[PDB]
Amino acid sequence: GRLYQVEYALESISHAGTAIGIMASDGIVLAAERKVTSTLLEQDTSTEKLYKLNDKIAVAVAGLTADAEILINTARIHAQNYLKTYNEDIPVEILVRRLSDIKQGYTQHGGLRPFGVSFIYAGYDDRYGYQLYTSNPSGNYTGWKAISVGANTSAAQTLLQMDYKDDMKVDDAIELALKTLSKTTDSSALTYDRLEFATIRKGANDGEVYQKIFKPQEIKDILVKTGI
Amino acid sequence: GYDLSNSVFSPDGRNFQVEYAVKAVENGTTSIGIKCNDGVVFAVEKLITSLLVPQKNVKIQVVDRHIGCLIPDGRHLVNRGREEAASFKKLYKTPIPIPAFADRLGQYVQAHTLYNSVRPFGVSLEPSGSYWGYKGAATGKGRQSAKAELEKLVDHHPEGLSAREAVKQAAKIIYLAHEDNKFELEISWCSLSETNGLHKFVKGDLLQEAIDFAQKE
Amino acid sequence: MFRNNYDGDTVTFSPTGRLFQVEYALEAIKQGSVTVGLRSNTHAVLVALRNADELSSYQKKIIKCDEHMGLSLAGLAPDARVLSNYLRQQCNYSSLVFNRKLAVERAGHLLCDKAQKNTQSYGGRPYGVGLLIIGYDGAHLLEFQPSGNVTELYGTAIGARSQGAKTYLERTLDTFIKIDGNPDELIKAGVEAISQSLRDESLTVDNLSIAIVGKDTPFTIYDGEAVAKY
Amino acid sequence: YDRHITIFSPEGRLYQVEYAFKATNQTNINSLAVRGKDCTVVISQKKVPDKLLDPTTVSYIFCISRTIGMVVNGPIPDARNAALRAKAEAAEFRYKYGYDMPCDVLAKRMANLSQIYTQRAYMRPLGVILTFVSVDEELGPSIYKTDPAGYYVGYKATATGPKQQEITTNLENHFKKSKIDHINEESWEKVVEFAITHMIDALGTEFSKNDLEVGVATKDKFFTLSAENIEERLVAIAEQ
Amino acid sequence: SSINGGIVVAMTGKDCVAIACDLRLGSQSLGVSNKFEKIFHYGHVFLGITGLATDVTTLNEMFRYKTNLYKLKEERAIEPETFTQLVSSSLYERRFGPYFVGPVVAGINSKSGKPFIAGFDLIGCIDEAKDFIVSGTASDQLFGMCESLYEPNLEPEDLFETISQALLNAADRDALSGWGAVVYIIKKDEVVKRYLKMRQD
Amino acid sequence: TSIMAVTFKDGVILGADSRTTTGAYIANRVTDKLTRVHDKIWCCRSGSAADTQAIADIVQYHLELYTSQYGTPSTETAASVFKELCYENKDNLTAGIIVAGYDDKNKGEVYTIPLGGSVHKLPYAIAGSGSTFIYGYCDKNFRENMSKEETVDFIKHSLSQAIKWDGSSGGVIRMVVLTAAGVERLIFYPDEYEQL
């Protein structure tokens, strides 16, 4: 009992931009590649593919923009509802399962096109620590240590499998993501204006500043330091 | 393809469903209306099939005591017109003027030509919702002979016709129209003199006189 | 061969102005069995003649709508049930609000108005049953077709080779029209009429049903050992 | 589907509104609208071939409000439906905003309704033109015309019908000669005479008092001329 | 209303603001809690709510919800004036069903840099004053103290003393207040929170 | 408030005072209580100002729609519309209305809609708080057919007495005459009617 609409959505996502999420022992790193260029299109569209659902959870998108915006707004509303109801931050798995259930419902009732969007969730909570998830149009969500979605999924997965360790640091994850993206893009070299970066890390002080979204200057500096 | 559903415009800008409804109207029995001096007379042919009671198959209907009028489609239209007349009477305390009643009927009929989910009416007020004022009106299978007779009457009476003679003229025209085929006559009257402006059915001695006059013609 | 492009739904007119679905619904009456209706000046009767097999009962054809009116059906049973329920509700409303027994002509008008709505709606279906209505006393007799037409006849017959009964009634109109005061003779005339429509088939106490209503006589249904020509 | 319902064709077309434009010419009536310095004149052909018709009840001119009149090109059922809707909208506007609805606002409302008809699949467009005329409190003599496609615009003068092209060309030449946006005639009778003469020249035929219908809009109100007034206007035209 | 007690007072100084409140929570005469804070902050704007404690908590939660959604959608913290308009609209949305609260908003606009204080009535009528705003069951005493003591263009050190003295002296004359006080001194980039020692607690 | 309407040979005449009071304080002293609902159909309102104004606006809208659709409504039609509005919402309205109009019926026409929404057709009608003091007088000085000047004098005397004896009535006397020539508006000041 195959689902043709879900397969079409997956094929459409396979032609979208590549996103990489790497989980370390003390932080999570999300990276995405910008592909649209017109020499006159503004690149200040807030953040094109990286989005914040709350102060603790971030998401990376691969697929159609409107469905992504709808799902992100729904996730933000759900997180705020949970915060108002229980006076505590929503666990990552609950929000991921909520979005997955929404996708599954959109893949079962007639007259509704399935969401051709793949999500990479990076979150932190006090029950499991750092968590990384991937959700697809079919409605299934899976936890991962290093995951990639988009165009060059297989090559990026192979590269991550070759050079991933269970005790990597945040900077190690950043370098691994940059090197994996640089070896899979079909644009010869990777540049700052075509890249989006985000980190979710907790310092020695229990502040939990999970909102570090890299500026273009910071992305350029990181690329220069790594050597891409 | 354009003629298979209602409310669909043909490339030349026509609705063939309404034209087919008009074709269905043209297959009906003859109905005549004569506008005399301060009155209107209506005449209806009624075919006889067999065991049929000769007196109770009335086809003429009255709206608001002063208006005269596919049989079930006509019945539906008359019921809607009665509802509209009652609404007007309740709102304004006066009997609804004939142009207002005609306009409301035209709007209701034109409503059934806007959506493909409904079928246009197949009665005679044309099925497209169009209507106008007439000195004489003829519809049905034998409508052309009736139209010719009505034109003859209009030419012969430039100063108007009396209601009493209009009844006999209607009977004669109905008989001439039925002459093509090979039946009963029902006549209804509404005049300011013999009926005080109220729609009435003319029967009894006057009906016999009209029938005899038609037979002698 | 000879595919019809204008017999799909009831909201499409034929190029000559026909409504083929309505005609098919009219022809659906021929599927049902034979019903015969008479009328005198004081009484009115209905005669109705199916059995699935020797181990089954017989379908009901006569339905009482009120203490003074009733009907017989030929065609689709559920449509007849819906129409009979509507007529019962209308009679109940007339008897409750105005304390007035509903006239048979008004009942025919209501049936025609209700049946008209199924020929113009799209997505539905016209009724597939024909009805014979009889009323109090003067006596009245109506024939209702699913197209939305009523007749007010002296007598008629519908369904499954009913032409013989109709011809017999056309012949004996003047004979049966004036049997006032003798309901039994009118019932026997109706029995002879329905026998004229049988292709050598016999009548028994299981296949024959009768209905009678007249002056001082409320609507009464005879079935079983009561249709033994007693 | 794209030929029977109002959806885009592969060429980005709407083959149900163009058919409405075709249906606008089922009748053979030509209408002409001009505006004076303090009035606006509309003239329409009146054809009553049947001798059993009542000529008083045959008209394609409607009085929407006290100051706004309309002339419709197309079938009469759609014309009367649009007239009823326009009258209801004008009355509602007067009740709500406390002042008389302008001609351009009514035209815009009817155009928006036509656009709604074009965009929804279950509603068919009306094959009417709906030329509104008035003398506006702020604008003055104003003529605004719509179409089944939802498009509306104002005109100095306009013509509609199967033979509208010759009338339009004559109007364009006249306005090129005059180099002004209206007709310089203080009295509306002269404007009616000018309109009748222009229609006669364009159509190449003469008219009687039963072959024309006239509507005049002034600051006070909009009114339809009777047959006797048309006869007097024709006599005045014939006098010179 | 006026069954749980509580008082809040906000004043405007030189390039700074101050907002102070009591800490008593009770059921009529009985005292229940001495730690019930009535001042909250979202982004850089502070809100104090007096009246029914349940409505205070509900409004705090709802305004935190709305401010978080605003930050997510607009990628920017909300300013005191926009927050004042939002609170007024939310209060008026409950016309004929109002929250039995008295709100007071304080804060420094991030862009312009000028201080801002405002108060609200039962149904959200905005009262903007350039000197001080008072709310609670001891509003008359607070008005008297503020009129007698307040001076324009006060340094934060003097502003803290003025607002603390006003709040303490107003609370000492009110039976439904005075189980501890907390004062916020708000500047362009620094906020100081201080607890006060007082009688009856 | 004191309001009246009387039919005479050439049509109908409507008269009203110009005082609106909130309790014992006169909120308005130049009130116009004569409301136009059609070119030759006018109404006189008494009672709650908001209810009467809303009803008048609704009736005006209905009559404008009637004119657009049908032609010229009769005065009985306007009276029927007023009756429907007052009778349907009798539990939430306080309005006493007098409908006066001139049409082909000639000699004018006057209908009365008091509290409850009833309809009465009278040759002349009086309403308001000040009418109670001028009842008997109006029953001793009214004749079926009168000229314009005599009718104006009768209205002036009646309204002068009503203003004199009623503290809720005062100000100027406003009159509207509806005839075949059209609509005429007359103003009579306290220096004139306080004597006669």
Next chain:
Amino acid sequence: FQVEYALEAVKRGTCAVGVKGKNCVVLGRRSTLKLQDTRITPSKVSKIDSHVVLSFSGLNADSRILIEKARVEAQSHRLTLEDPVTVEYLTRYVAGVQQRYTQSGGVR
């Protein structure tokens, strides 16, 4: 067809085995990838309540809806009758939900 294709989709799911004994019931995962975190894994055997457990086979996303509905129905029964749901009642409820979803077109 719709039911047959649903059964075919079921046939592609992971194997599940259920056995009952004298006083116990025993309910019976694919190969995780090298970069897959198994610390947070939804177990294939989900307990509907303290006395009734469920094990699915087929599409996991569609089974989550059934599990959630079964849990909600069990809590509703507990709140409405003060008695925890029985095994047969819960099975009948799940079967009724599936049967209702089969109708009304039922693409899947």
Next chain:
Amino acid sequence: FNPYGDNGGTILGIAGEDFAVLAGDTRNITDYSINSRYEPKVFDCGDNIVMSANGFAADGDALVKRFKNSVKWYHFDHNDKKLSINSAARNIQHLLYGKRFFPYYVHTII
């Protein structure tokens, strides 16, 4: 506005061995005035069932008409089953409790 009133009267139902008796007044009154000296209060609804509702005349008449309509529809829907007295009592209980919060202001004896 009070939607209730009192019309007096009294009724008496006695059950025997093979018979039943339902007796009643015939006087309809309002306060101190006699509306009618002969207004029957005991009716015959059919199937040897007699019902009398005493008190508010309007409510009693409404209940009687409603019960008779229910009996006729019961005969229609069950092939003339000859409604029993206990079934009639249950049906009347349902009719009376249907207007639980706007009750009939009558006492019913069957």
Next chain:
Amino acid sequence: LGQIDYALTAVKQGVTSLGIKATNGVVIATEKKSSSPLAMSETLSKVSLLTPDIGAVYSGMGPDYRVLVDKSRKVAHTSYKRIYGEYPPTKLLVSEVAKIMQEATQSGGVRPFGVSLLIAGHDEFNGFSLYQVDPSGSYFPWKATAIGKGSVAAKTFLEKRWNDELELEDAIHIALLTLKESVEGEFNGDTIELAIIGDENPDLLGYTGIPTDKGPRFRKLTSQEINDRLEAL
């Protein structure tokens, strides 16, 4: 191909229109087409004010744009205003318009709008901005862009002309040149409709007395101003 592609074709068949964003403003310009000298051009407007600081221009089916302008004007007050007491920023209004168009595309029995919108605006904390909204419901920020019939040549010219130091006057000059290079019929002030989002104009507020209340930033050029600018080409 579906309805969205057909709507895009209809947009491509429409009149061009442009949009150019500079350091201190945004310029929108378009051509009015009326092949009938009897018709009056002033009665029809192709550039519509959405908010005192946000304006819009379109390419495609005119009546759809006329309805969409009213819907956007209503949603600018219902959604953002009457809540925060101020007009929405450009991004949020563009998002609401895109939501309206997306709902039109997704709703059953309704065809998508056949227009593409260029929306110019200014707001605090974001400066000036220019966006394009497609019939599908997706919006994209732009530095300089064009749509309609001669959009390819206009885009090439804008790419060859746009830079980072461009000012409002230079943007107006470039827009006028681009319009002149692709004018279908007659190039004068009565056939050109140009608007600018720039500095606030206190003379258009209508009243004085409130120092905080500033004038609108949207300003629609008159025919005389356009003719004077064309005299400088």
